Amino acid sequence: MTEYKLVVVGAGGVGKSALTIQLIQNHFVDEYDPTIEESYRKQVVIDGETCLLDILDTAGQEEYSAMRDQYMRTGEGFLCVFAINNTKSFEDIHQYREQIKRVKDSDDVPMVLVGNKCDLAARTVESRQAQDLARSYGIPYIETSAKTRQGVEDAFYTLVREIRQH
Amino acid sequence: MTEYKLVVVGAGGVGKSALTIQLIQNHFVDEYDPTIEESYRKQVVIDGETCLLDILDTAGQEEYSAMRDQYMRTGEGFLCVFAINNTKSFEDIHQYREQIKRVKDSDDVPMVLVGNKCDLAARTVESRQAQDLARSYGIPYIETSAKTRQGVEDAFYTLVREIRQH
Ligand SMILES: Nc1nc2c(ncn2[C@@H]2O[C@H](COP(=O)(O)OP(=O)(O)NP(=O)(O)O)[C@@H](O)[C@H]2O)c(=O)[nH]1
Ligand SMILES: Nc1nc2c(ncn2[C@@H]2O[C@H](COP(=O)(O)OP(=O)(O)NP(=O)(O)O)[C@@H](O)[C@H]2O)c(=O)[nH]1
Ligand SMILES: [Mg+2]
Ligand SMILES: [Mg+2]
């Protein structure tokens, strides 16, 4: 069956994991639990096609440096997450994008920008700001809550759909 | 606020209306009720942006001929629906696409192809067939059920998102 090798990337603490566990296990994780690397495989149906979601959950910062090159060479599509109440995670998006273009020999790589935690009142990252960025990158933007589950399927399925169209 | 002038197009009986009423009124309409033309306006939030969904629901066939040119000149994005158990509605998609390119002076117009009624066992339109078509048009494809509500938000929001990116 078609397999879609997806990897979830972004700054430490932004909800990369809580977002992947909502998809696979249908529940919010409200725990302190920093990822070294996790992987999730799931037979799923998206728009009538039977496919396996092969997802890599990654680390926020760590000695993950050129340690990242290896999985960014193997991922087919990227979820690039920041938190809407953490301005420096929004800003670090440029570093993750460029390194993925660098190891990919590509300016067009399947990707979607995700502003997570849209449930929290108190954002510092305005959606206009983030949607303008997603437009400059030629990237769709989708806000999410791992807490509420708002948009989580929508972010993962839009990315499976960026990969169908490339 | 941003307004997104969307119109729902396709063959008679395919679920264009049931799909629009699930979005606006949160309920399945399981009635025989052929549209001349209906319009729905709704203040909604999509990915943090406050916007009005101005949707035009249209007729399947009728004396709607160059009678369509007028609204296809005014719609910003199109939802192109067929039914997955009705081969000729899948086939009539080419006629709706081309006329929209014709009155639009455009090869790239925001659009998504929707195979509706994915709940019914007994399809005659295979998702590979329809996803290949959506790929040839440079269009995303999303299956839906107005009955179940599966994918309805997903089809309407992906189209609002095609319009953000154009
Ligand atoms: N309210 C709110 N909190 C969330 C959301 N997503 C995650 N959290 C919280 O944010 C914190 C970090 O979540 P986690 O998934 O561990 O983030 P991470 O990006 O995977 N951290 P890391 O880079 O170290 O692996 C946790 O307290 C989690 O409950 C969200 O949608 N909203
Ligand atoms: N089981 C199933 N039936 C559906 C679905 N969508 C619509 N229907 C049924 O299909 C029939 C037509 O629905 P309707 O919304 O009126 O279609 P239309 O495309 O708007 N007809 P028209 O072109 O004349 O205006 C109705 O019986 C409706 O309940 C769906 O998701 N699945
Ligand atoms: Mg984690
Ligand atoms: Mg109708």
From Swiss-Prot, chains A, B:
The name this protein goes by in its record: GTPase HRas
Tissue expression profile of the protein: Widely expressed.
Residue numbers carrying N-acetylthreonine: T2
Main function: Involved in the activation of Ras protein signal transduction. Ras proteins bind GDP/GTP and possess intrinsic GTPase activity.
Regulation affecting activity: Alternates between an inactive form bound to GDP and an active form bound to GTP. Activated by a guanine nucleotide-exchange factor (GEF) and inactivated by a GTPase-activating protein (GAP).
Disease tied to this protein: Costello syndrome: A rare condition characterized by prenatally increased growth, postnatal growth deficiency, intellectual disability, distinctive facial appearance, cardiovascular abnormalities (typically pulmonic stenosis, hypertrophic cardiomyopathy and/or atrial tachycardia), tumor predisposition, skin and musculoskeletal abnormalities. Congenital myopathy with excess of muscle spindles: Variant of Costello syndrome.
Motif Effector region per record, residues: 32-40
Impact after mutating Y32F: Loss of interaction and recruitment to plasma membrane of PLCE1
Domain of life: Eukaryota
Modification after translation, per record: Palmitoylated by the ZDHHC9-GOLGA7 complex. A continuous cycle of de- and re-palmitoylation regulates rapid exchange between plasma membrane and Golgi.
Species name: Homo sapiens (Human)
Reaction(s) this enzyme catalyzes, per UniProt: GTP + H2O = GDP + phosphate + H(+)
